[PDB]
Structure formats: structure tokens, C-alpha cells
Amino acid sequence: QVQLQQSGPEVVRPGVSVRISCKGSGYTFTDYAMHWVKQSHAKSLDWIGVIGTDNGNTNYNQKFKGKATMTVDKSSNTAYMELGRLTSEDSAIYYCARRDRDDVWFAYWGQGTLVTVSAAKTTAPSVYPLAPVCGDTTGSSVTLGCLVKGYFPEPVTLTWNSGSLSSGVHTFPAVLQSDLYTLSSSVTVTSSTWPSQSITCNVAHPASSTKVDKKIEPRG
Amino acid sequence: DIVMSQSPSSLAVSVGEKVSMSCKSSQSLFYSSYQKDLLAWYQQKPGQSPKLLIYWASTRESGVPDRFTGSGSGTDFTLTISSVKAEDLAVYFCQQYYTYPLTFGAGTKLELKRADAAPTVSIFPPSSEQLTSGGASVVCFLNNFYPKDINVKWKIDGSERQNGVLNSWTDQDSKDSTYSMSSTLTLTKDEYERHNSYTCEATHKTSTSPIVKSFNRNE
């Protein structure tokens, strides 16, 4: 019942440092070093370094020298990693991990800690209906959309017709422009049916307590 | 540092196929005292930490299904799945532990093969609501295409734009195995009202020429 339990997600301003933790339970903490691993979103894995849980000695990947510091509180079975003077390149999921009973392959991983480096404050989205123009009907299928722009932090929830329109929908992952998020969604229905049968985008952004409905209206 | 080179970066598979992927290290990982190679493989799915599959190049971790086989010695290693199941769609990584720093390959992602499919493209002018607030986003959707590699080019009046363009791709659809993409061109209201023709052009393997959607702001 080896468990590596990591601290929760962090939103941190650029230029400051963040301290993340990894508590080892279900085993003799001092019998295995603690390793840390960076995973940039959609990217690979990078080993940051290792700290001896018994001796407190450290060995950092030279790629992370002066970015990462590691410490341990043996009394607490907790290892800590400090990431310093953060930039947007530091935004990633960070894992702790440990070996099994032999060499350093990673048999046990923590669940990861998400670090997001941003100066932004909580911001409500603007929600814009996207009504079709010539070329937006292909065959008997018309595509409509909804643009959700300039919000922070994640997430939003978007539905169509309060969840009743679910097939024919594509809701895209959020991306950062400037330092705010934007997301879009498309919905595709039988042309003859619109605008006779109404279609409405429903958007919720919990962090700002906003809930907006935008009916798509014909360009007239 | 020991460089771990995985290929291919992506592989389209079919259920029941034998699947092979390659991991080559820039140095030998063979350790004589053990008579083993210091190489592991991992599986990772979206939203989860990596899971150990294989260590010392060829020992399956307990609980790993016997369709996973690791092979090779020295520098050239292979992970083979004898008969691939849908639950095996994931990213696979190799890792050396001959020396510090530990190093991983860039992964091989397994996706599901389907027939090639051109995108359905649609284009959307700024809403009156956004214009009123002084911004202008032009959105292009490129929906339900296969394979995932696609290029979008924006043109205004007739000239190509790079600035102000942000793209988002869905993961592979769990029902039809297609991909979709949104491309959004963001301008000031002033700039947007100074031009007239807005064009989104999709280039994809399924056509020798682009799919072009365009509107004139005046019309």
C-alpha cells in the first residue's frame, strides 16, 4: 500500500517561488530516495533530480540547477521541491516518484502537482454567439458556434440547449491568449431546422460566478 | 546526457495487430554484473501518471498483461504488443537508468487507424457583441478529419497572416476516430473594419488543393 501523496494545484505569479510536497506512506520512508519529474503539457518527461531521504543529499539534473531545490522532513515522511523565480516555461505537472527494490526505475508515482505560472486575476468570459454565413452549410448540415473569450482561471462549462443538443458538438480545449483563456464550441444541425428550432449556448464560469446564455440569431 | 530516441512518434493501430515501437539510446545500457540492460518502459494515459510496464529491458511488472514484450540489448530496444487491445491506446516511454541524469524518450503515441477524411470547414465573423466591446475574432472550425496533421493558413484581402492566430486541437474522437481543430484570428475592431475579405485555408493529405472558406465583411 505504497502511496505518494502530492500537494494540490498552484497558480503562481512570475518571478516568485513555489514549494510543493510529496508525502510517502506504506513503506519505510528512509529506505528509498525521492525523485522528481517534470512533464510539460503534451510533452515528455524530464528528471529533475533526487534527494536522499536518509542523508538529505541532493543531485540535480544540470538542466534544473538553480531552478529546483529539494528538501525532506524525515519526521513527516515528506519531501519538498522548491521551484524558484518562476517563468511560463515552468508551467507543468510535477511528479514525485520512487524505485521498487532495485535500480531507479519508477514503480511508484505521485498523482502530480499542477503548476500554472500566471499574473492573471479572476476574470469572467465574454460569450459571443457565432451565427453562420455563406459556406457554413455543407450538404444539409449547418454549423453554428459559441466563442468564450478572456477568462481566468479554468474551467468553464459549455452546453447547447441546456445539454439537450449533444451530438454534432465539438468543444475545444482552452488556450491562453495574452494571459487569459479562450475556448470555442461548434454545433452542427440539419439546415431546415434552424432558425425554426432555436439553439442557445450556455456558459458557466464558476470562479467569477457567471452563467450566460447566448441564443444564436440569424444574420439578417 | 544519454539521449533516448523513440520512433515513430505516433502510430495508428488496429485492434488485434501486432504493434512494435523503437527506443534507441545514444550509449549502451548493458550492465555486466546483472547481465541485464538498464532500460524501462512506461504507459501513460491522459490525466494519469505514467505506469511502469517493463524493467531491465524485458521483465514485465506484476499485473502487466503478457501481450507486452520488451526486447533488445545494448542500444536498440523494442516494445512489442502482440495483439493490441483498445485499452492499450496510450503514450509509451522508454527510460534509461545506467547513469544520472535519468533520461526518457519523447514517447510513441498509439492512436486508432480509420479512413482518411477531409475536414468540414466553417468560418465565422466577429459577433456584433464583440465588436461593441472593441475586439474582433474570426473563427474557423475544421471538423472531423483524419489523420491529425493539418495546416491552416489565414489570409486577409489576399495576404497571409501569422499574428493573432491561435489554434486548438481535440484529441482523437472516442466514437468516430476523427480529429477536429479550431483556428481563431484575433484583431482590433479597427483593423478588422479596415479589411474586407477574410479567408481560412485548410491543407490536408486528403486533397491536393486547400479547402477555402471566406467571407466579405461588407456582405
Binding site: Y32, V50, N57, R99, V104 | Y97, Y100
Partner: peptide
Amino acid sequence: SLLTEVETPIRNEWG
């Protein structure tokens, strides 16, 4: 100058 998991990933090599 004793070797541990900090200096090398190879269990065989630790003192």
C-alpha cells in the same frame, strides 16, 4: 566517498 541512490541509479553500486 560512499555511493548511494543520490550518486548513481544502480543498486549494485551502493556501499
